[PDB]
């Protein structure tokens with residue numbers, strides 16, 4: 577195993593919401609600890625491939641930046657992340673995606689698991705898996721956001 581770290585915080589002015597997805601498990605990774613105090617999620621990741629989903633929101637700016645990063649972990653414990661996608665848009669539009677009936681579910685779910693005020697977000701025990709592989713999946717999200725934006 578190897579310990580990794582992302583941000584999950586929702587304050588007065590901004591919100592940084594990062595979740596990490598398991599490429600193999602085809603659903604989000606169950607985090608071993610959450611840090612309400614410093615607004616952080618702590619993961620114990622089997623060496624493998626992982627997508628990190630980033631949502632960054634300046635509320636007062638009605639600003640939302642959504643990213644997707646590829647997180648590669650080797651058996652030597654070495655971590656390397658890279659962004660593969662990024663877009664910037666109105667937060668109001670992003671909050672609207674939650675209620676979009678015909679949308680990329682994992683996306684509608686990520687958004688939906690955003691952190692409650694001053695709390696962190698959380699992930700639930702699951703064996704559930706989406707239909708598509710990580711490529712299709714990412715692409716479906718991209719294809720949508722473009723039409724959405």
Ligand code: NI
Pocket residue numbers: 648649650
């Ligand atoms: Ni490798």
